[PDB]
Amino acid sequence: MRCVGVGNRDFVEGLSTWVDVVLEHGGCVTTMAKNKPTLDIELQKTEATQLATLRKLCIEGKITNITTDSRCPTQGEAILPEEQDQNYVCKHTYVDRGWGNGCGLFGKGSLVTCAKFQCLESIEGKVVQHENLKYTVIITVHTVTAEITPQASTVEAILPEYGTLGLECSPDFNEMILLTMKNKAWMVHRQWFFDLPLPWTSGATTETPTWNRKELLVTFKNAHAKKQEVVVLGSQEGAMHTALTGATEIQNGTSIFAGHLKCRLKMDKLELKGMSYAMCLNTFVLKKEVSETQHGTILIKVEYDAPCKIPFSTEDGQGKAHRLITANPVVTKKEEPVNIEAEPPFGESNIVIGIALKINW
Amino acid sequence: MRCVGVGNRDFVEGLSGATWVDVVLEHGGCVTTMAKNKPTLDIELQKTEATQLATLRKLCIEGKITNITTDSRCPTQGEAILPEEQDQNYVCKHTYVDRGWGNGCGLFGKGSLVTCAKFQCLESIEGKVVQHENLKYTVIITVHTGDVTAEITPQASTVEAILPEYGTLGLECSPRDFNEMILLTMKNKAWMVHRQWFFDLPLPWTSGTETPTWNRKELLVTFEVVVLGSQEGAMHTALTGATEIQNSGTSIGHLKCRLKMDKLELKGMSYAMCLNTFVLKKEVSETQHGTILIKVEYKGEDAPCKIPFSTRLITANPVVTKKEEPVNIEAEPPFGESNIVIGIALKINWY
Amino acid sequence: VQLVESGAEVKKPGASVKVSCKASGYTFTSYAMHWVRQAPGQRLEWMGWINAGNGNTKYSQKFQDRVTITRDTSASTAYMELSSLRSEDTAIYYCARDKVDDYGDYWFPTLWYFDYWGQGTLVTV
Amino acid sequence: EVQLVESGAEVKKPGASVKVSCKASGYTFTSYAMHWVRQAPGQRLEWMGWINAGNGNTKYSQKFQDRVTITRDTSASTAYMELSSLRSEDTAIYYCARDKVDDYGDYWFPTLWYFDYWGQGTLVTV
Amino acid sequence: SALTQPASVSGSPGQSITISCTGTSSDVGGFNYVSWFQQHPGKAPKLMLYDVTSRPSGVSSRFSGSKSGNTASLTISGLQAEDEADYYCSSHTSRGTWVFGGGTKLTVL
Amino acid sequence: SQSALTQPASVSGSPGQSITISCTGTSSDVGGFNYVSWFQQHPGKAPKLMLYDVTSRPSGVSSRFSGSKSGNTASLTISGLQAEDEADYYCSSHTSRGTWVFGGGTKLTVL
Ligand SMILES: *[C@@H]1O[C@H](CO)[C@@H](O)[C@H](O)[C@H]1NC(C)=O
């Protein structure tokens, strides 16, 4: 049904009302109290609601529009209009000139090369603010979601037919930055992201951006005083993944599982359903063999009059007795089976369901 | 002409009227050799290649994942089994998952599961071996005149070259380890790296035949299953302090040689002097080493003649062959003010 | 809960067909969408499924190269595209739903999988 | 003799592309860069680009850099010029012209006697 | 097909009938993901049984199921004229796939 | 197709006289480098290189053709004009941007 079969499952009981629990992702807690229904609390989602894209780092870029300008000695340095264009990365050098290549004078003449930079593949850096954290909790009764914010810490949700439950939950994001790649995400420190050796631009959502620190992926190397060649560093994707293997990984969506939530349940106004129902007088049919759920508890699958209480009793060689994990089992329809979770009887005995089937296990 | 506009230029002269001259050639540089009554030569190292190399390894820098396969079992039913677990194309991992009625199991417990991914490489690099015997130096010898290649192997070190109309030159070169280094070849560039350094690179590799088998695939695929991504940029970063060469054989560095000009013959010594006036066809200019180039044209129906020159000549025996075709003369002027006289007339003031 | 499939199409061998499956009456992103075809007079045959919450898919080895299953969350509609069509592909194509877990993942199906089926799209090649 | 031979006259539709060839004979094809120059009727000569036959390096005029692709076949000792997205303005005679590379096979600076041999010229009408 | 069903099944109205579904230890002998679908001519299959014994709320109790080893079976008691149709069993495999039975043609005499 | 180098449209002179065709560019093409070449084109023929390196001339070219350059203007001088000299003449220059530019062309007519 739910919360059954989960390995990291906690059973918490109301003290001699209120119930204190700790929810963690991938885990479920089953709480039980005197005269109160047994419910399953599970932390479904923990999200960052709205994030601002602060930077876009370029991990793979391309080069277009290569332009060159050379001058003879005694004519000064070369000049390109593109040196002022921020789409271009440029560098000056000096090359051997003379009569042989069109100069009246022999010497080293200035040369400038500019390449137009375009990013093909990029990653994003988003900002997380503590007030935009949104935990999602789901509450289910043994045969209703509520969202929790640091702004709205206490949540009152209504469980149909059982009353209303109260949830008082209590959970440095401004000093961390969420680094987003193709579909993954990591939580890293602000300064480290700021010092990443990759060209970046600020994601103003406007196309044809202006990239800064372009020299970190485009550099120049001049060979034997007769040319200048422009090189691209290549895809820094794997370098990023390697550098981020030790950072805290989340799932991207913006689902964080690096956070737990301690809550307090108020069952004062909780009412137990089916106290005015009659008992079922007909027979139950074993739908499945009973099995043990890793915690000693046993699951009994039965199929069925009216909405009724399910008669459940434990009798030894001679003499009956009354412990159920599923509180007040009720058959709502004859067509739909019901699963019953029980605390196993110690010592071989007769487990009677109805008024009836006999099962030992 | 040649060897003049180059900044990395060496002037070596046969000492006290000698016929042999020892020089050292390096790429991007040119050497000017001169001897008494011998033509001035320009020696240049055109190419330095490694002839035939064996690709020892192939490193995978970008790979892809295809055909993910899964096998799960309920508790008390044993381990999961996939046929690909023995198949060397696949990287696999075993784990345990919570199973029960919810996932189709009669019993509640941790059931075994195996996941396998098929590895395929998208873009690769090579690690090749260079052997000292496959080195081939290419040298080019030219006569320095205003108006011939030899190949050298550590096997055939000494070369006799023919200069047309000028005789024969002797070259005794000596190539100046490759056993402990490996050449890393990428998309079109290559670097010289130590053998152990290449061997300890954390990338999946194979020695191949296509449709290969890759080793150490866990260096790019681990366990949800993830790919580490293109390690191209990481490699380029790792080689910033390396020696960049070009691959196609492969083009790589220095060469110490000895030139024997004993049998080299100088042409045009029997011509007479020109007695008419010379006309400056181009402005005289100083080279990166103090020498000056003078482009002149002769005026007067003389014959092929010696150009009267007075102040040391870099260009040996300047000769006007026709009045219509100009001649370029290179001379080394003395440091400080001096008069360059061309003819017997043009007078030029240099500093 | 209702599943609506696109109309019948007729194509020539070698072409491709793209049939749609629009969901109504339930949260589209909380259910995986499966595709099953049935040749005339033959049994049901499973082609693959898509997790509508995150786009994760998994195909049958018989259809893994020619089949592409996609989704439009804004349209709450799943798509099945079969390319390189053959005369054998003449069949009725159904879609069938199954629920995902609470974390949006689909590793193990529910026991009541394929509980709702679309009317079916006839594709003749 | 040194000779440059170009392909026959081609007539194409606007928006199409044309590939004219230039086969070199009488000299080492791999030791020379091949330039392409066009001349519209009644207009001046216009430089389109060049290809380094030794290493395949090319350089195009910024007027034609998107529509022009220059290639070479070393075994055929033949240069190729492809002009795409043809317009009626592209109606012109297309020449090839040679220039030598340095001794290292590079073509960074031309010689002073560049364009010393020219092809007969190929007429392209759009 | 990985699951084996009888080709054709017939019975008199009001009788009880059983259709078997034999697979392997990796589909039916391994997991309880055994389902039964009914397909009337021209219509889509309708889920009749799941979790071998369980049946949807809308489905009548006349349909019951059982499983032993690698063989499951759908039993229909008190046959009616509406039940004449094709019946398909299905199973989730160990390799994360789905397999269907060959189909059984149930005819009401 | 506006020329980057400027030539006179038409030039004429009596036979045997000397005539000059000018070619004005900028400090980045003609005023910057000695890559000044002169090509002769007879109508219907491919251009023929007449001068290169400003003053230098190919072996096949007569010595009557001489060249000069001053500032941003080069010049082709033809001494002793004959009827054989009638053709179109184009100056060209390697620029500072690794490009080539040609003059508009001059039609030389012998009166
Ligand atoms: C830069 O690229 C665009 C591409 O079409 C081109 O139009 C432009 O002219 C290029 N270069 C210069 C120098 O303008």
Author numbering:
A (entry chain B): 1 to 16, 19 to 145, 158 to 185, 190 to 270, 273 to 324, 328 to 345, 348 to 380, 384 to 389
B (entry chain A): 1 to 147, 158 to 186, 190 to 221, 224 to 238, 247 to 271, 273 to 276, 279 to 337, 348 to 380, ...
C (entry chain H): 2 to 52, 52A, 53 to 82, 82A, 82B, 82C, 83 to 100, 100A, ...
D (entry chain I): 1 to 52, 52A, 53 to 82, 82A, 82B, 82C, 83 to 100, 100A, ...
E (entry chain L): 2 to 9, 11 to 27, 27A, 27B, 27C, 28 to 95, 95A, 96 to 106, ...
F (entry chain M): 0 to 9, 11 to 27, 27A, 27B, 27C, 28 to 95, 95A, 96 to 106, ...
Which statements did the authors publish about this structure?
We determined the corresponding X-ray structures to 2.1-, 2.8-, 3.2-, and 2.7-Å resolution, respectively by molecular replacement. The DENV3 and DENV4 crystals instead contained one sE dimer with two scFv C10 bound in the AU, with considerable differences at the two antibody-antigen interfaces within the dimer. In contrast, only one of the two half-dimers of the asymmetric complexes was compatible with the conformation of E on virions. The epitope periphery of the second binding site showed clashes in each case with the underlying M protein or the E stem. In the case of DENV2, DENV3, and DENV4, C10 binding selects for a presumably less populated asymmetric conformation, in line with the affinity studies.
